[PDB]
Ligand binder design. Structure first.
Ligand SMILES: Cc1cc2nc3c(=O)[nH]c(=O)nc-3n(C[C@H](O)[C@H](O)[C@H](O)COP(=O)(O)O)c2cc1C
Ligand SMILES: O=C(O)c1cc(=O)[nH]c(=O)[nH]1
Length: 367
């Protein structure tokens, strides 16, 4: 627990955290432990090969902690200490709200998957604002060091006007963020995903873009859309088209999935909610691929979904991701996995004659 070995956390400690605590308390302990920085300071040095400049920022390694782990920005600094190259803080809603009734998270250890239906449990804009404000200049220094911060916006359950909620996020948190995320891909909030529709998405993102533009230069973040893995091809076409039109700065590719692949062994496979972890991977990768192609490599993509190795990582990059985020992999292999991905990602780049992550982005669309 002090040295930071993968093979220990994998077989012993992590199956015991699981064996002892329900998935929610485990997450909360993890957030506590991480904000306190109890974790090992990662053995692995980041080589220059992993550096990516994208979105008006240098990223020291391309492996991000995904939205959901740190819903309320309590653990940003420990996440960096864990070795992520960039941190994203979990969907924040304008007003605080509590989320769906427990139980709302489940492990499918046999599938290395998770299903969650939290439905945007948030401390809300005020609280997260003060939290981020209180390290604002630390963050400024971090970004310049190649550790950018992303903020991921969602909408209140009751909210009558979707576009106005996100507007509030841009206004309140936009100034504290290197990039902002319009999350319209959560499975768990009645009607949210239908904001992925062309007309409804253009009107929403016009307003987001507009607000963003009204922020001062130094506090003017990049704006991306996080989309679902369950989109029809018409949907993807459209998202793609609107994106190019309004000049959106990027996409985060794939929230969790409401599909349930043939093969899930998990006793809890038929729980309502978003499916994450391994069963999402290739689905997720394929969506990076369609989106990269549709936007013609001119729209940066953050790949997320089932990443738990260098290969997993490098696959999405070759697919066209500029950056990847993982989350679930953390509930199975623990902190070490960040080290792993980075180091396996590194090896593979060399093995396949790449100079660095930058050369390998979209690599598949040129081979
Ligand atoms: C417990 C849980 C909560 C999540 N919460 C959010 C969320 O608030 N906002 C969001 O954009 N994504 C959320 N995600 C989805 C992740 O951001 C990610 O898109 C998905 O899990 C695929 O990556 P992974 O398999 O490595 O976890 C959540 C995922 C899980 C595991
Ligand atoms: O908080 C949630 O319920 C949630 C939001 C989201 O965007 N994705 C997810 O899997 N869960």
């Amino acid at each position: 627990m002090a040295t930071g070995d993968e093979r220990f956390y994998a077989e012993h400690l992590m199956p015991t955290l699981q064996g002892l605590l329900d998935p929610e308390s485990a997450h909360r302990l993890a957030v506590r432990f991480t904000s306190l920085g109890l974790l090992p300071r990662a053995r692995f040095q980041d080589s220059d090969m992993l550096e990516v400049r994208v979105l008006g920022h240098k990223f020291r390694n391309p492996v991000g902690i995904a939205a959901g782990f740190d819903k309320h920005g309590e653990a940003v600094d420990g996440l960096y200490k864990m070795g992520f190259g960039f941190v994203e803080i979990g969907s924040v809603t304008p007003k605080p709200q509590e989320g769906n009734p427990r139980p709302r998270v489940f492990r499918l250890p046999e599938d290395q998957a998770v299903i969650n239906r939290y439905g945007f449990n948030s401390h809300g804009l005020s609280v997260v604002e003060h939290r981020l404000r209180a390290r604002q200049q630390k963050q400024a220094k971090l970004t310049e060091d190649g550790l950018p911060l992303g903020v991921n916006l969602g909408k209140n359950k009751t909210s009558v006007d979707a576009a106005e909620d996100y507007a509030e996020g841009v206004r309140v948190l936009g100034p504290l963020a290197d990039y902002l995320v319009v999350n319209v891909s959560s499975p768990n909030t009645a009607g949210l995903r239908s904001l992925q529709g062309k007309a409804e998405l253009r009107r929403l993102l016009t307003k987001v873009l507009q607000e963003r533009d009204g922020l001062r230069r130094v506090h003017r973040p990049a704006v991306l859309v996080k989309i679902a893995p369950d989109l029809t091809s018409q949907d993807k076409e459209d998202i793609a088209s609107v994106v190019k039109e309004l000049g959106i700065d990027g996409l985060i590719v794939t929230n969790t999935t409401v599909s349930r692949p043939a093969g899930l062994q998990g006793a809890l496979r038929s729980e309502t909610g978003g499916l994450s972890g391994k069963p999402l991977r290739d689905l997720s990768t394929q969506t990076i691929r369609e989106m990269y192609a549709l936007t013609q490599g001119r729209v940066p993509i953050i790949g997320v979904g089932g990443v738990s190795s260098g290969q997993d990582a490098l696959e999405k990059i070759r697919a066209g991701a500029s950056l990847v985020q993982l989350y679930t992999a953390l509930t199975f292999w623990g902190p070490p996995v960040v080290g792993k991905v980075k180091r396996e990602l590194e090896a593979l780049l060399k093995e396949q004659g790449f100079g660095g992550v930058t050369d390998a982005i979209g690599a598949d669309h040129r081979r």
